[PDB]
Design a protein around this ligand. Structure first.
Ligand SMILES: Cc1nn(C)c(C)c1NS(=O)(=O)c1cccc(F)c1
Ligand SMILES: [Cl-]
Ligand SMILES: [Zn+2]
Ligand SMILES: [Zn+2]
Length: 573
């Protein structure tokens, strides 16, 4: 306890020795308190000017305007549960490890990742680049590094905002020890069977249709209420077992990340009463986002195999596993474990499961005792399943089967169109030039052309934005699945590569010659999913689109533009 976290606290105490007090009106119950000390979404004008009909749709316009789950506790699982998790976790790290080798990630790999801008959850230096291009940073890194090899920590402290930011250094040390899980694709579908890491939104619907082809019961897609808060100290121990597969320095650096920063956290939170609270806890998820995704995927795979074992009668009670049950659990994993992984699609806390039969629906004792309580259903009410893979929610989408005029089959991603338009009208951060705002609009437009071409309004609005932004300007994002739309290559060429040439579910490789060969949803179904077709507002927008394109061209100025509208039958004379 205080031996592991004391140093980090001690060091914070001294930097604010002027202001340190044990505040007695501290609002924490489950978070151990230690002391205190004194300390918006912007609109994208390019996308909004080209989506006028949505200016009067509150579900779009309200998206641009504007704890009691973190400060909760999770009971210790029973002995039977703890044994089921330990056996399953041991088995799963071995399967994931059969064709992969754990290894340290490099300064070079980190330096490259920071010099191409990604989600790093980081807070003497300004930007990430400067610190990476400074030897002093690496000496600070080196000091903590040697502290970790010595089994101690001084500067690895979380800052809450839920996202848990760290100083780049602590983030580097995290990356060095555990970055291999993402960098070497441990959660790819090929390696994990249930995972979808690196798949891409143009593959997820085909993956759910392949799960639907298995014999068995309904498709279950239960969401957990606040997954990150429900990660138990036991879950963190089972995750730590990945270190059993490591050696040398790597093994020691990884054991220190798990022991010192995951299983024993130190956090700073702003309270308006404005003070800084220094709190600690031993449970809950609070890594960096990328490691969080891989370990969430691992623990979710483990939890869903145990729920499958429960439905199949492999064990009778979570109170205690008998000696023979243990062997039966091990024998089930060796005999059918890989087949049962193949019946799932798991993306962090998000799952779809097609079990052997519907006994799964009421197999709730292990799931509830592991702390993975289902959202929006009563604790002991059986899960409701989906009879049709096209209705299943996954990764905030559903999926349509769409038949091309030439007979070939596309499985396409979809979500309510108000959500798509409302997100594309939002930027994050300050100091955006008009060029940078235009290039972010172009990134949304090209994503729409590639993923949501089947939605009449989005194909039209994507064509308009690409016509309104200079043809050679490069799409950008400030935080960056696989992003095939992030390119200045011709979008028809990219569509053909993604949906025909490289699509393993498409046997006929005949290229598509124009956008008019690429189908839409049915008119009614397109309207079900939030299309504004059949509204006078939408008809006037579509008719007068060249006027809207010309307004934006006039703002940006005298640049080289292409007209993409004649790619659509209605503007093609
Ligand atoms: C020109 C038009 N104006 N109106 C009022 C309607 C029904 C149409 N036809 S439509 O093909 O655009 C269409 C739109 C929405 C749903 C649907 F099933 C069909
Ligand atoms: Cl259904
Ligand atoms: Zn540390
Ligand atoms: Zn849809």
């Amino acid at each position: 306890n205080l031996d592991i976290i004391g140093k980090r606290i001690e060091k914070i105490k001294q930097e604010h020795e002027t202001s340190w007090h044990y505040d007695q009106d501290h609002p924490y119950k489950t978070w151990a308190y230690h002391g205190s000390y004194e300390t918006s979404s912007m609109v994208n004008g390019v996308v909004r000017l080209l989506t006028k009909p949505w200016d009067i749709i509150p579900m779009v316009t309200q998206m641009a305007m504007t704890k009691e789950k973190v400060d909760t506790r999770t009971q210790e699982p029973k002995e039977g549960t703890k044994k089921l998790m330990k056996i399953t976790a041991e088995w799963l790290w071995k399967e994931l490890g059969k064709k992969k080798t754990p290894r340290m990630c490099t300064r070079e790999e980190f330096t490259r990742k920071v010099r191409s801008n990604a989600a790093l959850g980081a807070i003497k230096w300004k930007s990430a680049r400067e610190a990476v291009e400074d030897s002093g940073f690496w000496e600070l890194v080196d000091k903590e590094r040697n502290l970790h090899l010595e089994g101690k920590c001084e500067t690895c402290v979380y800052n809450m905002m839920a996202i848990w930011y760290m100083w780049l250094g602590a983030r580097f040390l995290e990356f060095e020890a555990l970055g291999f899980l993402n960098e070497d694709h441990w959660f790819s579908r090929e390696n994990s069977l249930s995972g979808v890491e690196g798949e891409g939104l143009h593959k997820l619907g085909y993956i759910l249709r392949d799960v639907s082809k298995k014999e068995g019961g309904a498709m279950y897609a239960d969401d957990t209420a606040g997954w990150d808060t429900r990660i138990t100290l036991e879950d963190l121990k089972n995750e730590e077992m990945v270190t059993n597969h490591m050696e040398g320095e790597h093994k020691k650096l990884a054991e220190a990340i798990f022991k010192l920063t995951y299983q024993n956290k130190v956090v700073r939170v702003q309270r308006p009463t404005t003070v800084m609270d220094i709190i600690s806890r031993r449970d809950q998820r609070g890594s960096g986002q990328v490691v969080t995704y891989g370990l969430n995927t691992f623990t979710n795979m483990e939890a869903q195999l145990i729920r499958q074992m429960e439905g199949e009668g492999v064990f009778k009670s979570i109170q205690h596993l008998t000696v023979t049950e243990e062997i039966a659990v091990k024998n089930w994993l060796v005999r059918v474990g890989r087949e049962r992984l193949s019946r799932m699609a798991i993306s962090g806390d998000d799952c779809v499961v097609k079990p052997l039969d519907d006994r799964f629906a009421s197999a709730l004792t292990a799931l509830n005792d592991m702390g993975k309580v289902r959202k929006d259903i009563q604790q002991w009410e059986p899960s409701r399943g989906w009879n049709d893979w096209t209705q299943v929610p996954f990764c905030s989408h559903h999926f349509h089967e769409l038949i091309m005029k030439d007979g070939r089959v596309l499985v396409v991603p979809c979500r309510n169109q108000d959500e798509l338009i409302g997100r594309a009208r939002i930027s994050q951060g300050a100091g955006w030039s008009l060029r940078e705002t235009a290039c972010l609009g172009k990134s949304y437009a090209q994503m729409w052309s590639l993923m949501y071409f089947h939605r009449r309004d989005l194909r039209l609005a994507a064509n308009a934005i690409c016509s309104a932004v200079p043809s050679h300007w490069v799409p950008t994002s400030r935080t960056t699945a696989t992003h095939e739309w992030m390119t200045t290559e011709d979008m028809l060429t990219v569509w053909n590569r993604v949906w025909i040439q490289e699509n393993p579910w498409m046997e006929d490789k005949t290229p598509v010659e124009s956008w008019e060969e690429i189908p839409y949803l049915g008119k009614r179904e397109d309207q079900w999913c939030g299309s504004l077709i059949g509204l006078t507002s939408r008809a006037t927008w579509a008719k007068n689109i060249q006027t809207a394109i010309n307004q934006v061209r006039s703002l940006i100025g005298n640049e080289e533009y292409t007209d993409y509208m004649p790619s659509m039958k209605r503007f093609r004379r």
